[PDB]
Amino acid sequence: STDRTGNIVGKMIAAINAVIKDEKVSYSEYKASTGWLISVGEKNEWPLFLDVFFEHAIESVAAESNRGSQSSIQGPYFIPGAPELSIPYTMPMRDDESGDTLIFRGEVVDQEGAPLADVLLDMWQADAAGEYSFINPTLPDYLFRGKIRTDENGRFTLRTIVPAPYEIPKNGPTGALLAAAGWHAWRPAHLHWIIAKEGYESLTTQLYFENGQWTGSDVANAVKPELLLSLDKIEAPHFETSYKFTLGKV
């Protein structure tokens, strides 16, 4: 512990000091950086900042041990206690909710490819303007957050709308850093999932949309090729898609 903490923290501090020496970071830049770091804490952006820049690396080590299908970062906007939904499964939406309807057909199987029943899935997403409930408190509580279960056939059908890409807020320290550094502040459109069943290893993941704006260029670096969804446009239009998740036994 003492040995390991020293090793990891020492290497990180050393690497930062090597860049300071290499780039000849100035006192003026140090003072600005001090003010900025203070502002991250004052604006409660530690989880946002860290999950943008570092969670993907943490998650990549964890993923080496994956026993089911492909995983991704959680990100900072999970909220516990999202509503248990009812058939026909519909994400919490307003009567006049903007956006293109999406019907998502899900399957959850084990390592043999056998369906898993009574799997719990938490899903959350941004609305068509790229806003999350609770995070934006002008949205109705629990908008676009819910829990559903699989069938005896390991299946569910879920109606929602296609989320918009998400921008790290420009009026915060993290957004200020991204602007200052000349880096785009966008995540591609995505659906978050936490998938659990007693006796199985849980799966935290994200799904994106093939050729979506920002999918090759995620600020959070959290996309993986296995996690791209293809959409069929259906006339009546709305979009339809499907995905199979895999859980590994404990």
Add this chain to the structure above:
Amino acid sequence: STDRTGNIVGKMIAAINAVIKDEKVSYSEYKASTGWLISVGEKNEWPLFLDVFFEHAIESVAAESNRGSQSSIQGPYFIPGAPELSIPYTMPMRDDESGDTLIFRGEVVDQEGAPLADVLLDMWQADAAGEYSFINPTLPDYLFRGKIRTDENGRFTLRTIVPAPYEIPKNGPTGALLAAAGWHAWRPAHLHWIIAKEGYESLTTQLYFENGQWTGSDVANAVKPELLLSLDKIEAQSGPHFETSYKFTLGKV
């Protein structure tokens, strides 16, 4: 420039991510680190943390452009407004202040080695228990903080006490990290100085004591060999005391 700040911050982030990958840093470690970072801000320890681990590197690049004598980090405990001391210059001390008496003979010269008169020097130090005024609010305000001036000969004599070495306090996040990484939290004993005169570049520096513990393992990595003082023990009326001499140089603007 966006180019420059992106280059610097990009390199830092990549470097931290390489360490995460090589050391297999876990989600549990990431969450503990998140809570730790939050605590740094909640306890107002950003200047302390950064000044412990990073200011030496910043100061070392700054120092390559020095026009005068050797410089060092400022650290986070300077407080403006210290009293102008009166002759014979004596640092603000309590009537029963403990510790060994130190007589410090200073000189300030220009880059030709000629004396500089009316140089203003701000000096601060810890007491014989390793505590700073304001920082530890139970000490009298401006204890061991004072301003003096060089005379016509560029000289001054200052009476004080030998400061103790300092531990970064474990009761805060910076000290908690040092403790958790198995690293000593000590700075060797030192006198801090900000030295200024119109038409000259200011000098920030620290002076340490040759014989002192921690000069080879400063938690802050701010010791430089030009800044080590030698002490002479003087036995004379009544009690032994210590004397030391230093010559500072300022370079013109």
